[PDB]
Amino acid sequence: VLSEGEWQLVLHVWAKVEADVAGHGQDILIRLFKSHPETLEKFDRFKHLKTEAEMKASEDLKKHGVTVLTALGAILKKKGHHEAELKPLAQSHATKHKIPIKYLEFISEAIIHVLHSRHPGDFGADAQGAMNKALELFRKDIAAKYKELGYQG
Numbered sequence: 001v002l003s004e005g006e007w008q009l010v011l012h013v014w015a016k017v018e019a020d021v022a023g024h025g026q027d028i029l030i031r032l033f034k035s036h037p038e039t040l041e042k043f044d045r046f047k048h049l050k051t052e053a054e055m056k057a058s059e060d061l062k063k064h065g066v067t068v069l070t071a072l073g074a075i076l077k078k079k080g081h082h083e084a085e086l087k088p089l090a091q092s093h094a095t096k097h098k099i100p101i102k103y104l105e106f107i108s109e110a111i112i113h114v115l116h117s118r119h120p121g122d123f124g125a126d127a128q129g130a131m132n133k134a135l136e137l138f139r140k141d142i143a144a145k146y147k148e149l150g151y152q153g
């Protein structure tokens, strides 16, 4: 697990995301889709977007970015005691959206990239390491639920 000092790094950085949830959310989803266009295919809602300019122009995509970061923020704020918040998410992503664990790894990389881009002064290697650990813990617990339900990977 994360040490107290590492959770402090994560939660203090997260406060910076909360100062502009829509901007960070938009940037993270665009970075995911550009870096890994195969992830687009999983969203019937977005698969029509073919270019980066189209992604930037979509109000619906910006709305979903808020949904994603609001859910992730609720989880991080539980400092690992996130069973009630994580369960519904693991269920829907395994059984309904059918999202492989690898794509959760890809979105974790996009989050780190955007935090670095937006906060070059604030988000040094120690915070980056701590954020990586927090997202790993998130993935580990989702993966366990996937395995339970017979999806895993």
Ligand code: HEM
Pocket (backbone or CB within 6 Å): 039, 040, 042, 043, 044, 045, 067, 068, 069, 071, 072, 088, 089, 092, 093, 097, 099, 103, 104, 107
């Ligand atoms: C940071 C990790 C992620 C969080 C916190 C997250 C959160 C959510 C939330 C809260 C919803 C709406 C409720 C629901 O259906 O459960 C949702 C919908 C969805 N998510 Fe995720 N998600 C994450 C990663 C991903 C990834 C990597 C993909 C695909 C590559 C994905 C695919 C979807 C799809 C297809 C929907 C349904 C969208 C719609 O048609 O309305 N999610 N996500």
Ligand SMILES: [Xe]
Pocket (backbone or CB within 6 Å): 024, 025, 026, 028, 029, 064, 065, 066, 068, 069
């Ligand atoms: Xe996001």
Ligand SMILES: [Xe]
Pocket (backbone or CB within 6 Å): 089, 090, 093, 142
């Ligand atoms: Xe998820």
Ligand SMILES: [Xe]
Pocket (backbone or CB within 6 Å): 104, 105, 108, 135, 138, 139
């Ligand atoms: Xe994640």
Ligand SMILES: [Xe]
Pocket (backbone or CB within 6 Å): 017, 024, 025, 028, 111, 114, 115
């Ligand atoms: Xe972010």
Ligand SMILES: [Xe]
Pocket (backbone or CB within 6 Å): 075, 076, 080, 082, 134, 135, 137, 138
């Ligand atoms: Xe987490």
Ligand SMILES: [Zn+2]
Pocket (backbone or CB within 6 Å): 035, 036, 037, 038
């Ligand atoms: Zn890829």
Ligand SMILES: [Zn+2]
Pocket (backbone or CB within 6 Å): 059, 062
């Ligand atoms: Zn707008």
